[PDB]
Design a protein around this ligand. Structure first.
Ligand code: HEM
Length: 147
């Protein structure tokens, strides 16, 4: 519950979502990690599909997009202790991809939390309790997305 929320919130002090250049770069590096290490997910990215980490670094789109997804991870663990808000927000995340026809097999949402934890691991050293807490948010998000 609230200890999971607390351990997740603090590993997130290392990924900024403010206005600085730091945050713009943390949003970009996340997409660098998925494009260079999960190449199948690049195809859901409309005419950026054969992008490399390189191409991802200089396109202004990933600076904005990176901020959209880093804010959604920060919102899912600050709402974890109120499951009604947490579940409602996960449904809206689904609805917002469906809005724009980004339809994804339910096992890509599970792959995401393996990708996020690897990305944060480059940003800070996660200890086993914190890794444990991200697994639990990941697991619950995945069941909810699965309806
Ligand atoms: C599970 C964690 C994820 C979160 C928290 C997340 C969050 C978001 C958010 C907030 C948006 C923006 C919607 C808007 O404009 O209002 C979005 C768009 C998008 N997401 Fe995700 N996303 C996730 C995973 C994925 C995955 C695994 C893929 C597939 C590679 C994906 C592909 C996209 C694409 C292509 C868009 C549309 C970009 C555009 O506007 O052109 N997302 N996502």
């Amino acid at each position: 519950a609230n200890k999971t929320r607390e351990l997740c919130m603090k590993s997130l002090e290392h990924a900024k979502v403010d206005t600085s250049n730091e945050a713009r770069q943390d949003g970009i590096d996340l997409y660098k990690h998925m494009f260079e290490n999960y190449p199948p997910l690049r195809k859901y990215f409309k005419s950026r599909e054969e992008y490399t980490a390189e191409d991802v670094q200089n396109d202004p789109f990933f600076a904005k997009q990176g901020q959209k997804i880093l804010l959604a991870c920060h919102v899912l663990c600050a709402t974890y202790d109120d499951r009604e808000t947490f579940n409602a927000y996960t449904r809206e995340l689904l609805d917002r991809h469906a809005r724009d026809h980004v339809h994804m097999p339910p096992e890509v949402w599970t792959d995401f939390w393996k990708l996020f934890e690897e990305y944060l691991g480059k940003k800070t050293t996660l200890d086993e309790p914190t890794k444990q807490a991200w697994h639990e948010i990941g697991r619950e998000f995945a069941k909810e997305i699965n309806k």
